[PDB]
């Protein structure tokens, strides 16, 4: 198996699908996590971006992208999977965009030759998540590579139906069964994203409790698991 995961930001793949990535690697798959919006940024930053940087524990004008890339390498190394950091700027530093992302994805498909691509459903409708998903759908459709979408975490813990580009639809939900030790490995990887843990934990300091409770609702035997859907072509498309 050659598994190409396509993450919008530096954290999403691990948050949403870290157990699936680590179990695929343990099973013997060749796993590569490409993050689209890992592009380098520099001052001048917007006041909103400066605000994010300070929340994350950096100076307002620090190189937050480099710090986050190092978090991602640490997290993905803990899952024993490879990384690839793309050129696109996170929405806080910003069809044209989607086309460029799709072009880069097609190049990566040619180089890595995945047997399966997994990316986000873009539950929560974040523009970068939608751009990532849509670009991945277009590139994989053109290259005839199968695709699955993961349930975006923690965004789906509260809110599930998404509008895909015309021609694509989802099959039935699959909820994986993840062993307690692999749950722990995932959560340990999530913790490597120190910058993001600030807001992910929130005032109740409860990210992992929330993720556990969400999974317990639908996963086999009330254990841990991750929801994904296969993508197929709609009729008349
Ligand atoms: Co994200």
Give the Cα separation of 47 and 66 in Å (integer): 19
Structural contact between residues 187 and 231, judged by C-beta atoms closer than 8 angstroms? no
Residue 129 annotated as lining a ligand binding site: yes
Q: What is the 3-state secondary structure (H, E, C) of the chain?
A: CEEEEEECCCCHHHHHHHHHHHHHHHCCCEEEEEECCCCCCCCCCCHHHHHHHHHCCCCCCCCHHHHHHHHHHHHHHHHCCEEEECCCCCCCCCCHHHHHHHHHHHHHHHHHCCCEEEEECCCCCCHHHHHHHHHHHHHHHHHCCCEEEECCCCHHHCCCCCCCCCCEEECCCEECCECHHHHHHHHHHHHCCHHHHHHHHCCCCCHHHHHHHHHHHHCHHHCECCEEEEEEECCCC
How many A from CA of 235 to the centre of ligand 1? 31
Tell me: is residue 163 an annotated ligand-binding position: no
What is the Cα 10 distance to its own chain's centre? 8
How many domains does the structure of the chain reveal? 1
Q: Which of 193, 213, 229, 162 is nearest to 18 (CA)?
A: 193
What residues have their beta carbon closer than 5 A to ion ligand 1?
8-9, 12
Residue in 185, 177, 119, 198 with CA at minimum distance from that of residue 152: 119
Q: What is the CATH number of the domain that holds 214?
A: 3.40.50.10320
Give CA separation, 79 vs 9, 31, 64, 212, in Å.
Answer: 17, 10, 23, 19
Question: Which residue, 183, 190, 124, is CA-closest to 152?
Answer: 124
Q: What CA–CA distance (Å, rounded) separates 89 from 109?
A: 21
Are the CB atoms for 84 and 34 separated by under 8 Å? Answer: yes
Give the Cα separation of 190 and 120 in Å (integer): 17
**Rounded CA separation 188/79 (Å):** 9
Q: How many residues does the chain have?
A: 237
Q: Is 90 annotated as a binding residue?
A: yes
> What dihedral angle (degrees, nearest 10) is formed by the CA atoms of 62, 131, 163, 232?
-130
Residues 6+ apart with CB under 8 A from 165: 134, 137, 138
Q: What is the resolution of this structure in A?
A: 1.3
Closest listed residue to residue 120, CA positions, set 217, 37, 215, 204: 37
Ligand 1 centroid–CA 11 distance in Å is 7
Question: Known binder of ligand: residue 128?
Answer: yes
Does the annotation place 85 within a ligand binding site?
A: no
**Domain range spanning residue 223?**
1-237
Q: Is the peptide bond before 166 cis (omega within 30 degrees of 0)?
A: no
Q: Would you say 72 is a known binding-site residue? A: no
């Amino acid at each position: 198996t050659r598994l190409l995961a396509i993450s919008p930001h530096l954290d999403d793949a691990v948050l949403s699908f870290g157990a699936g990535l680590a179990q695929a690697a343990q099973d013997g798959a060749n796993v590569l996590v490409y993050t689209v919006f890992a592009g380098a940024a520099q001052p001048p930053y917007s006041p909103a971006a400066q605000r994010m940087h300070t929340i994350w524990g950096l100076a307002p004008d620090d190189d937050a992208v480099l710090y986050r890339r190092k978090e991602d390498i640490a997290a993905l190394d803990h899952l024993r999977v490879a990384h690839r950091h793309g050129r696109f700027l996170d929405a806080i530093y910003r069809h044209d965009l989607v086309g460029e992302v799709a072009d880069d994805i097609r190049s990566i498909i040619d180089e890595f030759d995945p047997t399966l691509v997994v990316t986000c459903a873009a539950i929560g409708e974040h523009p970068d998540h939608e751009a990532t998903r849509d670009a991945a759908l277009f590139a994989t459709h053109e290259k005839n590579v199968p695709v699955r979408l993961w349930e975006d975490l923690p965004y789906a813990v509260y809110k599930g139906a998404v509008e895909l580009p015309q021609g694509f639809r989802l099959g039935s939900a699959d909820v994986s069964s993840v062993k307690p030790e692999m749950r722990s490995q995932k959560f340990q990887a999530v913790e490597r994203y120190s910058s993001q843990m600030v807001l992910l934990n929130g005032s109740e300091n409860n990210l992992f409790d929330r993720l556990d409770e969400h999974a317990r609702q639908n996963a086999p035997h009330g254990g841990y698991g991750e929801t994904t859907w296969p993508v197929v072509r709609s009729d008349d498309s």
